[PDB]
Design a protein around this ligand. Structure first.
Ligand SMILES: Cc1ncc(COP(=O)(O)O)c(CN)c1O
Ligand SMILES: Cc1ncc(COP(=O)(O)O)c(CN)c1O
Ligand SMILES: O=C(O)CCCC(=O)O
Ligand SMILES: O=C(O)CCCC(=O)O
Lengths: 396, 396
């Protein structure tokens, strides 16, 4: 029976939406969206995907099931996006990709895989991190440990505290990294911190699980992977859960992948079969649509050229909204160096506002931010940058 | 590490496909597909969905995330498809539907819901049943009990053995029913067996979990639900996992739903929130595509009229391939009453062939059937009905 089931709490994101889409003051602003918005304040569908969809609409002849791993062309592409082209990983066939229902689905299946085929009991998530991480892992039955990361004072990657907390991890634990655009700090390890953090990762014997979901939002497709790639040079085994929900604007089509790298072809094919069984038990096979779109775009030199350009457009909008934000504040009369904002990558960053400040900002000005003072830079337009920075200063 | 992971076994369906799509004898036939095929031997995409997709292609303006429960219009529609129109269930708001990645995803989330919010430890699957059921439930951590069902001798619903085995179930167990087209027997409870089986279900206190995936393939959309509806009149709580993969031909888009019925609005909304948390932890939100298609079709009086007609077409093809099969055998010279075939509904039925017979049929004739002697009636065309029945008789 259900009558005594105790109602769940409000999600650390979703709640805002509602008080937002209710806030009688239309002059409002929402910065706790996590989704991208253009200069208009709309989340359009990429032209490349539109072209991609009409193509499929014209070409699909059946909607018969996909393999448990989804569409091959999609798999090989993500592989090349992650590890590059001449990646031995690929050439030796010690990587197997499965199309999953989004980055989350990739995480949960890597979870159910690990949690039911290996002795991995704990997964080291950083402090802070995307909130759903824990829920995902915990639902697999695994425990979520936390390694330090953010430096509240200096607004940076406290590498010391980082390696420090990690040592408390036993050889055998899965340590969860963010390929680029660390949600929610927006602070990322330099190619040098990664390399050391990778070598120190083989020595202690960590099982790396890369959450790669904002590839292309920091520096570009290639650059944004140099980290994962660094770990993938030293490690013989690893798991990477990629999400095409942001960079291809395919949010709701649930497009992502769970790549598995093992020492060699035989071991990866052996383990992957078990990864497949984890999927058949979850949702059987993946939703073709979003992936068909992503496969054709990436395999079409013309359509890919457009996509790449569209992505760089998004990257640059955000990459400039940070400056507008920072210097507009300096004009509005702020007494606080917000420069650290410019240094950060991706859609997110921590404004440095107190849970109290973020509350009066909403309550007295209609500006919505995550309780964590996390602010979505992509929800800022030149049009609202002025009143935004205004409200913020009034509450500093 | 993965190097010692022991490779998984071959799926009780998928293995065939491969020896099929390899069998050098092109005169082959595949009857262990589980998917529908037209007179051509192709799994086309419904015209209504094609029209539905061009509509969306023309109308979508964003691919922003769906609610954890997916699209509302889809939810209300499935609700009306399941419980009917004037269903108090609907009018009192004691039913909440969540768009899930297919019937399987609906099952797994009902699983993870139950397994993490109620004392339900075992789920009574029938003997036999769709093989992935167990794997789904077991992956939730719940145990799969088995109640008798098929009558190998008389090829029928052994009601006695059925109610019989069920009594060994404690008030508190989830008993898994098949709304219509029992995969794989193709044998279904009459409106009268259902009603008794429903009343005897409230008395013992079972938690009904209806796997509804072939709605429209037995008698029609309305008729095919009179069972679920019977249980939903007597019960104050129940769960139904519906799949739009067959009847809308949307196989690979993963379209399905997990409906939850509780005693009243307050309890259902309270429990459902927990069902939502189970989803956010699994894949976050559902793939919009397949569901958008299904929502518009069902909400468009014109497009729905076409869909309904297309479905009735499929229903009748299968519903006639059974006769062709039966009487062609009687002509080919069979010494065995295969009449029971005509009595059965849906795409599947048990030919009554031994695992040995099905093997020589494949090995010596290129006819593929599931080890269980299960035969997919929708893979039979007038063109291959002749050699098929021929091979079968030669092995009787
Ligand atoms: C770091 C991180 N990982 C995974 C995801 C999931 O993306 P998806 O909706 O494709 O699951 C997100 C959501 N933005 C995220 O921020
Ligand atoms: C009885 C039963 N339940 C659930 C399913 C799942 O359908 P889906 O691929 O939509 O998950 C099937 C597959 N035919 C089935 O036969
Ligand atoms: O805003 C975020 O970072 C969370 C997005 C999670 C999701 O859309 O599933
Ligand atoms: O043939 C069957 O009945 C199994 C189909 C299962 C699936 O397609 O996931």
């Amino acid at each position: 029976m259900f009558e005594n089931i105790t109602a769940a709490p409000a999600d650390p994101i979703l709640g805002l939406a509602d008080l937002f889409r209710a806030d009688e003051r239309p002059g409002k602003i929402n910065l706790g969206i996590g989704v991208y918005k253009d200069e208009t304040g709309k989340t359009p569908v990429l032209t490349s995907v539109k072209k991609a969809e009409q193509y499929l609409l014209e070409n699909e002849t059946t909607k018969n099931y996909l393999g448990i791993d989804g569409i091959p062309e999609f798999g090989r592409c993500t592989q090349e996006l992650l590890f590059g082209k001449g990646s031995a990983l690929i050439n030796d066939k010690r990587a197997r990709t499965a199309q999953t229902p989004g980055g989350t689905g990739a995480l949960r299946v890597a979870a159910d895989f690990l949690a039911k085929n290996t002795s991995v009991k704990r997964v080291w998530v950083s402090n802070p991190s995307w909130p759903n991480h824990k829920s995902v892992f915990n639902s697999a039955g695994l425990e979520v440990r936390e390694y330090a990361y953010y430096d509240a004072e200096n607004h940076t990657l406290d590498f010391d505290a980082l390696i420090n907390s990690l040592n408390e991890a036993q050889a055998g634990d899965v340590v969860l990294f963010h390929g680029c655009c660390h949600n929610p700090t927006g602070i990322d390890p330099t190619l040098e911190q990664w390399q050391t953090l990778a070598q120190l990762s083989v020595e202690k014997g960590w099982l790396p699980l890369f959450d790669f979901a904002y590839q292309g939002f920091a520096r570009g497709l290639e650059e944004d992977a140099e980290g994962l790639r660094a770990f993938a040079a030293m490690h013989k085994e690893l798991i990477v859960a990629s999400s095409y929900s942001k960079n291809f604007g395919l949010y709701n089509e649930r497009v992502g992948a769970c790549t598995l790298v093992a020492a060699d072809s035989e071991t990866v094919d052996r383990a992957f079969s078990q990864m497949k069984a984890a999927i058949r038990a979850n949702y059987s096979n993946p939703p073709a649509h979003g992936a068909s779109v992503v496969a054709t775009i990436l395999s079409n030199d013309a359509l890919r050229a457009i996509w790449e350009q569209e992505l760089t457009d998004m990257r640059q909008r955000i990459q400039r909204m940070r400056q507008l934000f920072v210097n507009t504040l300096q004009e509005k009369g702020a007494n606080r160096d917000f420069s650290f904002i410019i240094k950060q990558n991706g859609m997110f960053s921590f404004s440095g506002l107190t849970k109290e400040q973020v509350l009066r900002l909403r309550e007295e000005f209609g500006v919505y931010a995550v309780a964590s003072g996390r602010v979505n830079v992509a929800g800022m337009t030149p049009d609202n940058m002025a009143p935004l920075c205004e409200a913020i200063v009034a509450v500093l």
